[PDB]
Scaffold this active site. Sequence first.
Site, mmCIF file in Angstrom:
data_model
loop_
_atom_site.group_PDB
_atom_site.id
_atom_site.type_symbol
_atom_site.label_atom_id
_atom_site.label_comp_id
_atom_site.label_asym_id
_atom_site.label_seq_id
_atom_site.Cartn_x
_atom_site.Cartn_y
_atom_site.Cartn_z
ATOM 1 N N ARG A 65 12.602 -5.440 2.968
ATOM 2 C CA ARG A 65 12.224 -4.029 3.017
ATOM 3 C C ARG A 65 13.250 -3.190 3.659
ATOM 4 N NH1 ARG A 65 6.980 -2.034 4.964
ATOM 5 N NH2 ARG A 65 7.124 -3.327 6.947
ATOM 6 N N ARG A 80 -8.587 -0.106 10.201
ATOM 7 C CA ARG A 80 -8.161 -1.468 10.169
ATOM 8 C C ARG A 80 -9.010 -2.258 11.172
ATOM 9 N NH1 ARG A 80 -1.917 -2.471 10.410
ATOM 10 N NH2 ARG A 80 -1.664 -0.322 9.518
ATOM 11 N N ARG A 113 1.173 -9.156 13.327
ATOM 12 C CA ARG A 113 0.573 -8.306 12.363
ATOM 13 C C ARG A 113 -0.357 -9.046 11.418
ATOM 14 N NH1 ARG A 113 6.120 -5.912 10.445
ATOM 15 N NH2 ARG A 113 4.978 -4.743 8.761
ATOM 16 N N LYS A 158 0.885 -1.235 0.000
ATOM 17 C CA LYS A 158 0.000 0.000 0.000
ATOM 18 C C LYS A 158 0.870 1.213 0.000
ATOM 19 C CE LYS A 158 -2.278 -1.330 3.619
ATOM 20 N NZ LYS A 158 -1.281 -2.397 4.013
HETATM 21 N N1 LIG Z 1 4.514 -5.478 -6.180
HETATM 22 C C1 LIG Z 1 5.605 -5.650 -5.434
HETATM 23 N N2 LIG Z 1 6.491 -6.658 -5.666
HETATM 24 C C2 LIG Z 1 7.585 -6.847 -4.808
HETATM 25 N N3 LIG Z 1 7.881 -6.036 -3.747
HETATM 26 C C3 LIG Z 1 6.990 -5.013 -3.474
HETATM 27 C C4 LIG Z 1 5.913 -4.710 -4.401
HETATM 28 N N4 LIG Z 1 5.242 -3.637 -3.864
HETATM 29 C C5 LIG Z 1 5.903 -3.224 -2.767
HETATM 30 N N5 LIG Z 1 7.011 -4.052 -2.595
HETATM 31 C C6 LIG Z 1 7.956 -4.014 -1.521
HETATM 32 O O1 LIG Z 1 7.225 -4.774 -0.415
HETATM 33 C C7 LIG Z 1 7.584 -4.165 0.841
HETATM 34 C C8 LIG Z 1 6.389 -3.715 1.708
HETATM 35 O O2 LIG Z 1 5.698 -2.652 0.886
HETATM 36 P P1 LIG Z 1 4.987 -1.447 1.599
HETATM 37 O O3 LIG Z 1 4.598 -0.525 0.461
HETATM 38 O O4 LIG Z 1 5.756 -0.899 2.680
HETATM 39 O O5 LIG Z 1 3.716 -2.197 2.201
HETATM 40 P P2 LIG Z 1 2.569 -1.592 3.139
HETATM 41 O O6 LIG Z 1 1.310 -2.171 2.641
HETATM 42 O O7 LIG Z 1 2.732 -0.150 3.359
HETATM 43 O O8 LIG Z 1 2.863 -2.357 4.551
HETATM 44 P P3 LIG Z 1 3.369 -1.900 5.976
HETATM 45 O O9 LIG Z 1 4.432 -2.825 6.459
HETATM 46 O O10 LIG Z 1 3.551 -0.441 6.086
HETATM 47 O O11 LIG Z 1 2.045 -2.249 6.734
HETATM 48 P P4 LIG Z 1 1.781 -2.446 8.383
HETATM 49 O O12 LIG Z 1 0.356 -2.331 8.631
HETATM 50 O O13 LIG Z 1 2.569 -3.667 8.873
HETATM 51 O O14 LIG Z 1 2.565 -1.169 8.915
HETATM 52 P P5 LIG Z 1 2.094 0.348 9.111
HETATM 53 O O15 LIG Z 1 3.321 1.266 8.984
HETATM 54 O O16 LIG Z 1 0.917 0.607 8.293
HETATM 55 O O17 LIG Z 1 1.545 0.287 10.611
HETATM 56 C C9 LIG Z 1 2.601 0.197 11.580
HETATM 57 C C10 LIG Z 1 1.854 -0.323 12.877
HETATM 58 O O18 LIG Z 1 1.252 0.802 13.471
HETATM 59 C C11 LIG Z 1 0.016 0.456 14.133
HETATM 60 N N6 LIG Z 1 -1.131 0.943 13.414
HETATM 61 C C12 LIG Z 1 -1.039 1.647 12.181
HETATM 62 N N7 LIG Z 1 -2.247 1.988 11.764
HETATM 63 C C13 LIG Z 1 -3.159 1.557 12.748
HETATM 64 C C14 LIG Z 1 -4.529 1.703 12.854
HETATM 65 N N8 LIG Z 1 -5.392 2.162 11.940
HETATM 66 N N9 LIG Z 1 -5.079 1.122 14.023
HETATM 67 C C15 LIG Z 1 -4.274 0.619 14.933
HETATM 68 N N10 LIG Z 1 -2.933 0.464 14.878
HETATM 69 C C16 LIG Z 1 -2.347 1.046 13.733
HETATM 70 C C17 LIG Z 1 0.075 -1.060 14.082
HETATM 71 O O19 LIG Z 1 0.916 -1.495 15.220
HETATM 72 C C18 LIG Z 1 0.780 -1.334 12.737
HETATM 73 O O20 LIG Z 1 1.293 -2.646 12.663
HETATM 74 C C19 LIG Z 1 8.587 -3.033 0.609
HETATM 75 O O21 LIG Z 1 9.898 -3.553 0.667
HETATM 76 C C20 LIG Z 1 8.242 -2.759 -0.822
HETATM 77 O O22 LIG Z 1 9.359 -2.230 -1.524
#
Ligand SMILES: Nc1ncnc2c1ncn2[C@@H]1O[C@H](COP(=O)(O)OP(=O)(O)OP(=O)(O)OP(=O)(O)OP(=O)(O)OC[C@H]2O[C@@H](n3cnc4c(N)ncnc43)[C@H](O)[C@@H]2O)[C@@H](O)[C@H]1O
Length: 215
Positions: free
Chosen positions: A130, A91, A174, A18
């Site tokens: 990543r 989420r 996660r 995303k």
């Molecule tokens: N097509 C493809 N082919 C190959 N490689 C590819 C590709 N597309 C992309 N890639 C590569 O794949 C990898 C991942 O891509 P990337 O683009 O980073 O994926 P993403 O979907 O952004 O995943 P995240 O790891 O950010 O999601 P998350 O929910 O675990 O973490 P977040 O920061 O949101 O949240 C952090 C934490 O915060 C808290 N949190 C955040 N939001 C909430 C909320 N709404 N409610 C409660 N807690 C929250 C939670 O603890 C959560 O876990 C990268 O290396 C990329 O280069």
Amino acid sequence: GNSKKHNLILIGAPGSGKGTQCEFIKKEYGLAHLSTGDMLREAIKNGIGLEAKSIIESGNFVGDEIVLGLVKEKFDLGVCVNGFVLDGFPRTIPQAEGLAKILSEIGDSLTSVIYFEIDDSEIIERISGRCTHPASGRIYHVKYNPPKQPGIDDVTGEPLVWRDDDNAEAVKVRLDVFHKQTAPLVKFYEDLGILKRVNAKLPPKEVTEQIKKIL
Ligand SMILES: Nc1ncnc2c1ncn2[C@@H]1O[C@H](COP(=O)(O)OP(=O)(O)OP(=O)(O)OP(=O)(O)OP(=O)(O)OC[C@H]2O[C@@H](n3cnc4c(N)ncnc43)[C@H](O)[C@@H]2O)[C@@H](O)[C@H]1O
Ligand SMILES: [Mg+2]
């Protein structure tokens, strides 16, 4: 977005690509990108401190009310009037309902919700490669989407770094909380008739073309 405004939610497994897709969506459509994970990491790094930090690095969800506060604050400041793409929010079902209230109170509505379909084994390979530019949130993958120069951000030249929640036990958390709590949102939005799916297993440019077909 101005003329290209959309009001978009991306839902998909942690690690599904995303934030990678939000880079083209921000730039092509002029939308505000709201990643509540990046927003929390920015609330942390500016010293919502140590307890939120531990919860994120364990892979668990932070409280609904905390994240709804941070999203509402963006809407109230006017950040979203030109369109937005929400990434990782909502989420849970209480966050989806809380968002429906925020939008109801301004008379705006969602355009589209895009669900990134991808399985857990490929997510483990996506997270394992990543690395991230911490100041901008830009992300790279050492195999499938590398920086142009080794070890450094394409825009600033600053080092890329590990994410502390990318450890094996938190990846398991996660994924587990995503299947239990987040996955129900796909029906929530299909019931509103605004959900479309993309095959997130494909290469990043092919996922971008599928997204462009829906927007
Ligand atoms: N097509 C493809 N082919 C190959 N490689 C590819 C590709 N597309 C992309 N890639 C590569 O794949 C990898 C991942 O891509 P990337 O683009 O980073 O994926 P993403 O979907 O952004 O995943 P995240 O790891 O950010 O999601 P998350 O929910 O675990 O973490 P977040 O920061 O949101 O949240 C952090 C934490 O915060 C808290 N949190 C955040 N939001 C909430 C909320 N709404 N409610 C409660 N807690 C929250 C939670 O603890 C959560 O876990 C990268 O290396 C990329 O280069
Ligand atoms: Mg992300």
